[PDB]
């Protein structure tokens, strides 16, 4: 199983949105399929998921707007390296 990562600064966390990072060498097809597998795995459990983006070029992975209750399910997914919860960035 993969690891979960949240921002250390608690008021800067943005739960409910997760960056699913796949293992280095995962083709767009495998990234695409995995994102669709999570949607179906969650669907069966009575959950609604929104794949916002599928990363293709910098990192193998995707962007999912989903419940944090699904994280353990998402962590057990094939080719997953880790899942980082989204968080805020600010003007400096």
């Amino acid at each position: 199983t993969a690891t979960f990562h949240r921002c250390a600064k608690d008021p800067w966390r943005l739960p409910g949105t997760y960056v699913v990072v796949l293992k280095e060498e995962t083709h767009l097809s495998q990234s695409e399929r995995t994102a669709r597998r999570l949607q179906a795995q969650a669907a069966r459990r009575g959950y609604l998921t929104k794949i916002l983006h599928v990363f293709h070029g910098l990192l193998p992975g995707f962007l999912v707007k989903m419940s944090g209750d699904l994280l353990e399910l998402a962590l057990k997914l094939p080719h997953v390296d880790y899942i980082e919860e989204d968080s805020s960035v600010f003007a400096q």
Binding site: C7, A8, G57, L58, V89, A91, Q92
Partner: protein
Amino acid sequence: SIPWNLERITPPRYYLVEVYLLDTSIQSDHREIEGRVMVTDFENVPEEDGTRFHRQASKCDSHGTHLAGVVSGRDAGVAKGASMRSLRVLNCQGKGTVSGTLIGLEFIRKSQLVQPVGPLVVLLPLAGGYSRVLNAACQRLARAGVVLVTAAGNFRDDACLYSPASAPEVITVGATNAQDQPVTLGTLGTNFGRCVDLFAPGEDIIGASSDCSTCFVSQSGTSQAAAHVAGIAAMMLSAEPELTLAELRQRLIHFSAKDVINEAWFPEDQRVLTPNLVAALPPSTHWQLFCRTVWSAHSGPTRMATAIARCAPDEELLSCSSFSRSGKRRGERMEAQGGKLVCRAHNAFGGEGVYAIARCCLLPQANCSVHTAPPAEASMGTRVHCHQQGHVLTGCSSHWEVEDLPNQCVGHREASIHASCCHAPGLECKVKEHGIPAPQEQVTVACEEGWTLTGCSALPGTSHVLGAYAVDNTCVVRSRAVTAVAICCRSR
């Protein structure tokens, strides 16, 4: 009449590249940046907080326009004549997301492959908490050859706690005012320590004001310091387009203003780590060997504690050293990790913790290898040397498993010695030494004009020696008969 900041980055003897700016919306029609900036179709921002948002009063383009004005601005810009590409990652309220920044950083990578080869800087005048993904995305872009310039952070904290500032393969910029002092922002101010590469002007910085087509405004923040460095990198890359990030950083470090900053403002524990450099343009177009000091994060007061200092893949680790404020240290070793040399320092049993300090250099065609010798317990001491012809000693290292103690390394009789031997064209290395009979606080020896410090060392004699570290080209030996041993190298 010239703004103090532009005046400051200019040396006494005083120059294609695309600068991507990932920030807020920009006033592309401003006199300063009109023609210089191209606003991309890209925009990934979170909804503004309604309860505090009045669109009619909100100047949504204040941050970005000023910054674009610092980089390329005609009348008050750093690199006047820089192609800029605007990306909206932050909303009106100067807030974005890691996910939004990732998509943007993906967009730059998409542009890089489609457009034909050419230098490209990436300005991230934003910060969030440490993000393992945001750092991985930057590391991937840097490997792709992009020069990333990030702001250190306005939180009067260790820059290593925020991203993109923490990603080591990105230039991190702190802020310094007129009187070469670290900028105060409210009760906080510039970030510091290990992750910050250098500082640049960041208080009272005059740039474009989105209020009207021709008005200007003075702004303060690490974003402004990051904008100056972006401009300097764009200025540099305009003359040498093939320059790597490692190459550009090494030059930025070298050409900066050494020992200006009154470090007092930084917490004592961070002073030694936080670099005393202020951004400055190199005085000409342009062989020379460049070396930087790479302090590692504190080992921790633990018994099995270890500190690891490593170089950029593009760099060679010429020497490794250790430091401990308490004085309790078990030495340092030049080991290999993931198929590359690394500076690992072990903590002494009762010790508050140790620091591992690496010396990373740019050496072309260099065959560098570690020669290790175990302690034999002799009257002379433990020795090791470069046997191979054309192999030069670039630095010594020595560690001891015990608790109570010509092109050659000499260490303690109880300590295992580690020498670094390099083979590089026309590389020549000399050893400079300097001793004091009863030290006051430190003994220092420095390499002469033309020679680059590759290896800083303390002569194994005194028991109570806190450590030894390289500062620019000066071997510094902190000692609460102390002799400082410098390994000076050069290429012709």
